[PDB]
From a paper:
Our best 3D structure was obtained with global refinement and has an averaged resolution of 2.9 Å. The entire ribosome appears in a conformation resembling an intersubunit-rotated state, with a discernible E-site transfer RNA (tRNA). In most ribosomes the LSU rRNA is known to exist as a single 28S rRNA molecule, but in ribosomes from Leishmania and related trypanosomes the LSU rRNA is split into six segments (LSU-α, LSU-β, srRNA1, srRNA2, srRNA3 and srRNA4), likely produced by cleavage of a larger precursor. These unique split rRNA segments are clearly resolved in our structure (see below). Our structure reveals that three of these rRNA ends are not involved in helical base pairing, which is energetically unfavourable in the absence of other stabilizing interactions. This problem is resolved by two new trypanosome-unique extensions in proteins uL13 and eL33 that bind these three cleaved rRNA ends and provide extra stabilization to a fourth rRNA end. The 5′ and 3′ ends of srRNA2 are bound by the extension of uL13, while the 5′ and 3′ ends of srRNA3 are bound by extensions of uL13 and eL33 respectively. We hereby name this extension as uL13-pin. uL13-pin is rich in basic amino acids and pins down three RNA molecules—srRNA2, srRNA3 and LSU-β –through electrostatic, hydrogen-bond and π-stacking interactions. In the structure formed by srRNA2 and LSU-α, ES42L of LSU-α is unusually large and meets srRNA2 to form a ‘kissing–helix' interaction through canonical base pairing. Nearby, protein eL28 fashions a trypanosome-unique C-terminal extension, which is rich in basic residues and rests in a groove in ES42L, stabilizing the structure.
Residue numbers in the entry:
A (entry chain AO): 19 to 163
B (entry chain AN): 1 to 190
C (entry chain 8): 20 to 57
D (entry chain AZ): 20 to 87
E (entry chain AK): 10 to 149
F (entry chain AL): 3 to 72
G (entry chain AQ): 15 to 116
Amino acid sequence: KIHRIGKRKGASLKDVSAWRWIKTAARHFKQEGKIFVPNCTEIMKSSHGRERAPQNPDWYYIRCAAVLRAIYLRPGVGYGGLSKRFGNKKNYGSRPEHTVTSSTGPLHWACKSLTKLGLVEPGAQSGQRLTRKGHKFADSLAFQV
Amino acid sequence: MSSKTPKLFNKWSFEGLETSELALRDHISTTAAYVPHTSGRWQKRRFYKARMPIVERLANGLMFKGRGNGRKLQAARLLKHTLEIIHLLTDENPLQVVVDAVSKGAPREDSTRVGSGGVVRRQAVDVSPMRRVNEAIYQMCKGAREAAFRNLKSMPECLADEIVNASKGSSNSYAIKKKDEVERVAKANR
Amino acid sequence: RCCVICSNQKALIRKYELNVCRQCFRENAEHIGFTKLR
Amino acid sequence: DQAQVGLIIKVLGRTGSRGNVTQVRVRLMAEAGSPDYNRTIVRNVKGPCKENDMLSLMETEREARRLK
Amino acid sequence: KQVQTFGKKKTAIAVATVTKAAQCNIKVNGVPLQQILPDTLRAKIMEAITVVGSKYYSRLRIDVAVHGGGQVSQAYAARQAIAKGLIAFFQKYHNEVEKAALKDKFLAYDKFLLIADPRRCEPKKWGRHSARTRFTKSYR
Amino acid sequence: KIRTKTVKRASRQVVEKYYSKLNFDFYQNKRVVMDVTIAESKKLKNKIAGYATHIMKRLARGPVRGISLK
Amino acid sequence: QTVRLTITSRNAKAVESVTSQLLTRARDEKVTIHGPVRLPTRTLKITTRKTPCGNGTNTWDTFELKIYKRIIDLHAPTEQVKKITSFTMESGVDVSITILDR
RNA sequence: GCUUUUGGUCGGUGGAGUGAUUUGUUUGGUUGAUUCCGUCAACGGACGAGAUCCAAGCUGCCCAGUAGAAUUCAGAAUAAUUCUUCUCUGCGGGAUUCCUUUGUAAUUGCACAAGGUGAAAUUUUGGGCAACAGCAGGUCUGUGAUGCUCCUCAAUGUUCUGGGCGACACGCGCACUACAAUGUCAGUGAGAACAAGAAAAACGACAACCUACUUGAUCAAAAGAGUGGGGAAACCCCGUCACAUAGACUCACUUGGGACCGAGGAUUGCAAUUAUUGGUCGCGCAACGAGGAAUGUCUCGUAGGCGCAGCUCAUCAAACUGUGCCGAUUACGUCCC
């Protein structure tokens, strides 16, 4: 009786609990160049660190809830003011760029591919521990830590 | 009442509240509410402003000077922090402190031009109930942006610092300093 | 882009919906079926 | 203390050039076994007013508009 | 055993689906009541349930379809669909009295649902800037 | 709120010519209007039906200009 | 061959004056017809400054259209549609329709 | 366009005046209203107002295969059924001063208010329209729309005619707009949600418009290229905001100006010598740190903030036109300016 998002608040959770599971597990893929900015009109360095480390499960929970998408639709989740913009009104646009590489990661490793979403959907199960296992001092009930 | 009738800011006590000053007492909002953000046609009519929780009224009056401002939801965040700092500073229902901080804030009496046609002339004029309500909240939070502008080491505390003080009547609050200094322009003129 | 009713190529002409009526103005040129409402 | 809390009996009218202050007849609010009314002292109020307003007067027993 | 209902604010449309069960909790537009992110909306969207009968009345399985407004007007779209949604039942599946108790307790609460409180942004006009704001004069 | 002489006048022709319109009901005294009168717009009848009931009601007070055949 | 009718015309009492009336040539006769409602209405909105000149009180026109689409659906009569549409003569600017699908 | 946002204007017969002219068109009360009632040497009529209109709001009927919900049956992760709640739209309902308040005012009247019912409560709301007189108001750069009278072939005509300007740097003076300097997003890095009016295309030839998908991707970004349907109900992930995600800053001209700047590079196309840019990345040390007098415009989904298409458009929005999101304090007043 557990669904993707929907039981979870996957805002900073169902991502992050997947993240450690992506990073600590050697299994996945991080391409070489990280020196380049992921995101629309950003002169700030792509982040402090952990650049793909925000990226991947987005694409999964992007895949999962939004079913079919792509390079073009998924950056709708990549957000920016596009504001460096020089003495003009700011305007707004998304990032096609790392998209392909991002979604190649799931093109490997048990998550379906050149059309759909996923194969086994680990997301539930591997996420099924969130209400079980809290990071923040998750309250749950007096029974669960 | 098992959280049915009674209300909570998140969890907070709105029942034991009343205003101290029989002057503006019995018309000021005595709260039953959860979140200060509500939407209705707030003032369609003339005196409708006195109905809704000051909690709104503050949260409503909460952020002038709009630049990229989110107002009510950004305001309510600030009032999460503001009240909490206040009660476990003052050891009271900050619903009281704020209620107690409205009254001591505004001047009971004013001095206006009654002068005719360019002549700047004086009269002692006697402030009205909705003007101690209104001007308090208005200037009360005006102390924020001032105390809050640059030198802050103090993120939300500015709002806490002029609600705490006024509820103490202290003359440091940018709130009350105008209640007196207007009356140095009142009992002097009359 | 010289346009329909006159030599013009000025009084900048609406491309909107590819009707090019500005030459003799879409005010003078009418019966197009437009109306004046709002 | 100085708070002497009266009622508006009525709005005795608009008064003044801008639209702001309004003449009002005030019924001293305090009631005692020797009821001290004025009974009525006319006042000028600053800002909007209404039929049952509580008007605490910090400068009491002044005879208002009279002159101008 | 069902009804259905619609919430509205400005353009925002909430639609209340209705299913029956007495143990159950409600999803947000797409996501459960508890977990909706801006706290300060939650306790509002608690008001439908909490205020008036918290528990004695409705745990009913309920889902809502909310499209046509930005985030907050979609939080006001919602709750109305619930209060509307709930009041629907006790007319169809219950007595006037149980209804009459509830909708009164709303009426005193506010216009939780009396209506969408119809207010729609004004059309921009003429050379007037936005609405009612005029292109500004100079050298006047 | 103030009724043009057109509302005023036509409504005086109805009350002069119809005592079918009796009850102080705006709603009854309205549904007799629109069938009998063509003003081509609703508001006219809505105005007319509103003033037509003022006239009738007031007749019970005393006489009114455009006096009845009574 | 279930056929389809798209009636696109502006003017008052044309879009109505065919589909409402003139399908009762088929509607109440041997044909069996599937009525839906007309699709939504459009407005084609151009706004031009009223002044031929430069000088103005900065005033603008707004000119509009309305285009009225009606969809009306069928089973398959053979050669009757050629007779169906041709029954009724009355309108102007209204649209004739030849459609096949499914 | 303006006088002109207001409520004004005109005549016939009659009356007063030698006459220009005047009465009608008024004291008074009320209304946004020359709007009403009353009074009346005027009586009966014409315009303007109103009302018709247009869109927005609640609603009926029709209706869905180019709208989208309910349910059961089986399947992954603890495809059959019936419908109109949601959407579509033509024509209709609804609103009226309707009860109430011995209310204000008042034997009449015309009405007003606080309150009630209702989606809406007082020209419901935002507009379009709009008299009569005028202005040497603007246009001879809109137009085979036009009077003169200048030009008429090394032309003031024409040139997909060639090149240059219209746009230049004395910080000059001025109007309107965009940026913003904070710890109230505040700067930025990620993450969660959700919107709406609107557009899209080619003939005297054998597709030139958009956009979704996925390759460009063993290595920047924007690019390149191939496939796919749309003639428009092909589309819905816009930022403001939400985030405590335990993120980074951190008594400062600065982890906030994006100006000036020289180097590469992709792009529209006859040609870009700055066309332009999620293009990089250097310059930051250019002002700048709540703005002197003076000045702008509005009152409820309103200002303000935010942003999106459209129009021009081969290429370019700090412009305008329109849509939507966030959403305010102050007066419900006076005539002082």
